Ligand binder design. Sequence first.
Ligand SMILES: [Cu+2]
Ligand SMILES: [Cu+2]
Ligand SMILES: [Cu+2]
Ligand SMILES: [Cu+2]
Ligand SMILES: [Cu+2]
Ligand SMILES: [Cu+2]
Ligand SMILES: [Mg+2]
Ligand SMILES: [Mg+2]
Ligand SMILES: [Mg+2]
Lengths: 336, 336, 336
Amino acid sequence: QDADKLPHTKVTLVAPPQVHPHEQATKSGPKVVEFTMTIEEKKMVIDDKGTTLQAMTFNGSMPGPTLVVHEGDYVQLTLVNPATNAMPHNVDFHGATGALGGAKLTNVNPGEQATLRFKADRSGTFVYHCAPEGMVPWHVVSGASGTLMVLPRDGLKDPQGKPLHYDRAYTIGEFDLYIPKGPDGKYKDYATLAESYGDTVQVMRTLTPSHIVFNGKVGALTGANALTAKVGETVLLIHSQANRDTRPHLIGGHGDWVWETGKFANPPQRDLETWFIRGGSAGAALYTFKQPGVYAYLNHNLIEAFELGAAGHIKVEGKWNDDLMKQIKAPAPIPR
Amino acid sequence: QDADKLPHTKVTLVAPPQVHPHEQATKSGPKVVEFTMTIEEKKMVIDDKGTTLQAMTFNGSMPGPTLVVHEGDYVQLTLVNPATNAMPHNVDFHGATGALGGAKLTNVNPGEQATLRFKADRSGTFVYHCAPEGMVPWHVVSGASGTLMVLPRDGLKDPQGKPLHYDRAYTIGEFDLYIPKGPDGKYKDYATLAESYGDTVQVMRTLTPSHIVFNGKVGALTGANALTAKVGETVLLIHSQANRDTRPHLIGGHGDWVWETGKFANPPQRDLETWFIRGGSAGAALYTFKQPGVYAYLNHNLIEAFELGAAGHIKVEGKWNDDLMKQIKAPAPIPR
Amino acid sequence: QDADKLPHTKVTLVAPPQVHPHEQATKSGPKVVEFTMTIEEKKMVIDDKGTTLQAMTFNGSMPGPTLVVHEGDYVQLTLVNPATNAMPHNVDFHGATGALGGAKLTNVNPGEQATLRFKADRSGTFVYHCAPEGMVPWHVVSGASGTLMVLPRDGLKDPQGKPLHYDRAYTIGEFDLYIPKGPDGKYKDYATLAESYGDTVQVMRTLTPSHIVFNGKVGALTGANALTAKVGETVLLIHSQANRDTRPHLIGGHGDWVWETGKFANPPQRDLETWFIRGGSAGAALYTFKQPGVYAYLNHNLIEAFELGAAGHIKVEGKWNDDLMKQIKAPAPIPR
Ligand SMILES: [Cu+2]
Ligand SMILES: [Cu+2]
Ligand SMILES: [Cu+2]
Ligand SMILES: [Cu+2]
Ligand SMILES: [Cu+2]
Ligand SMILES: [Cu+2]
Ligand SMILES: [Mg+2]
Ligand SMILES: [Mg+2]
Ligand SMILES: [Mg+2]
């Protein structure tokens, strides 16, 4: 399977929370799958009170888009750092072997680009992130991470080897942010990326985030921007956290089959109320919806979710099933 | 198994750390099991220096009592909010499917009551807690959570399918508390529940608890109130944490068989020194005692346990076994 | 297997990060394995800016040395507290059953020594630490912990029962330190151990460490003191944390087979990017190197690793394998 001789294809990446089209089980043999990504430095609004962040993102989103291949395929990435950026960047893929995950071979300054190829020989969801020498934590907490999903060639399996399949996949990236506050107790605003550095590092050292958000901002996946599904659909929820632990939960649901450490050759666990994604990794859960209504998907440290921002919504269409749950007596006066 | 036609029974709930009588493996078929609980708002003393908390509890205890049923049974709960309370409450069962775990169908104001029924179709220990719209974190950290244990109809099993059985079950609820301190560095005391709100939320946002207690207060399960057992007994230790991670350990023991994510259809792990309960869940461990003496059961972040309060005792009767452990030479002068 | 009749041998302990010579699978039957350790109170330099810590260590190192036996063997330890120390100490082995892990039978004051024997009947890596009544957290965070590895008599196994073997073993101890800072924002220095107490306990209660180090100091295992291996070697990485959670990761590698809860009778997980060691435990991972170069081994909360100190290096000799990873186009000007 020399690589140079296998066929090559090109994927067109989409923005979170969707994932690009792909097949679960494939008949095909190894390919070289080609992708391109641009780093974008930009100032973004992260809450509803106008707080800003001097951010660093892959393709302009938080998280960066999810890339999907099959086990045995070769990933061939072109990383582009445009001249309007001010800093150098690179990429570390946790799914790759050697060279600090690719970081040593992808150091690009503003105005440069580079291309790397690596064999994706282990299946699972894996984090990728920016990692420049001496500036690692700051480039990651500023937004630069995302997920690489490597499917087993024959699709996902339960513990006895039976096939599992999903109808839809969503990708959630969770970000712990360290926004400095001034003498007045109001969040600071910075003219450039470099100006933010000094103060940010000071908040970082306290280990206490100011905000924790899904996909870029408080409320990113709530109300009008809720994820959607229907009764009877099976959804794959991919959740990444490149720096800090989190504990996802679906209020009104469960994780039917969950790979919390995110590595598909291991058997999944079933019926979980709440699962655990270790900082520096991505995990995955399947759930088949049985009841319609609004569901909340969140980090079940409820202060982190409701005070700091780690909460989203899934709106589901269908018909109520009164056997699973039914109101016998609505709220009413106690009997006197 | 329409529900309306199955037989119905009524359980009488007891206070932690005990659990109400129940059977492990049952011959019976699905029932509708009926329970009733009252919410009680009250001011409680949480340490030995007189610190107080404006608390919200199910049935007046922290945690709320454990409810036990078998897989396939239907839980039918009556939730009662007496007129002496000041706020509205509800309940979210993580063992239920739909309607935000039951929260949408149980919103009761002071002086009202409501009844919900749901099918318990997944086995394991599951957290339940209060969850009112816009006030979630505060009602949970104030004390309102507990555990629902759903046993598999044929009892608990080891990984090769062999039967496991316990002689006694205890339930431990761990609570992270955020009690405000004043200019003097002394804990504040509040006349009403509502008066405490503003300051509490400020301590919460720091993510640093003032106290972490088992079952309501520092020393709740120590010295005279230790849990009890005897050499040769097999105990089931149920441990819940509705908001924050913890890591239980038995000094001088192990977890023989442990379900850390708390879901009985998965195989347990064996011989654990320390296990991990994710915030927003309940887990379970079995241990058979082999040596008499005092054992400490605690959160093995030792600052959390010894400085903040997360430590209890188990006193065990029986005969010392010198093969497992023996003192060869007692403490004595080094040889000169 | 009365103990008094089995053969007895004596092991000679070495300093971290190495582990003393031992066999994986053994033909032998139960022995009484004898070890001796001295507690040493000493002031040590923990970073590169001269910060000091008033430390308490087993045999003068952080962590204490790893002790290795086989399942069914009896551990016989002599603990020695020299007259130049100021405090009393003891030891709690998480691998032992009864007497608070041995703590009640090993209380030695300066100038005394004691000998304990316990049966090592459960396999896995287990933490040991000092635990004196009323002073537990402080003696542990000051440096007094290490690992006891109990191998299964027939060596380590994969999940289908196939044999796994390693060529080299390293031991990493991770320590969260709470060094007080003064009005000037400079770290305090203390003349004696007892003088440090009062202030340390105050930093501890904030739950926010000032430093988190591998093996004693920032940079202990970096650059010139990197761990070493070669392409084709299989290494066993043992990682202990007696007080706080951590999440290890090998940049450019994976955990081929990992026991995160560290208990060898359970099947390992494979292909992990990042794993989780619960505070109060030790875990183990195997990895076979496939590419030469420098690898970083660290806690993947990247603030904890790069700002606070939890990062080390592994330098590996061998020949680059261009199929796993290859640079297609080096960094260069974007095309105009
Ligand atoms: Cu960058
Ligand atoms: Cu990384
Ligand atoms: Cu409430
Ligand atoms: Cu919940
Ligand atoms: Cu000590
Ligand atoms: Cu311990
Ligand atoms: Mg994980
Ligand atoms: Mg859990
Ligand atoms: Mg562990």
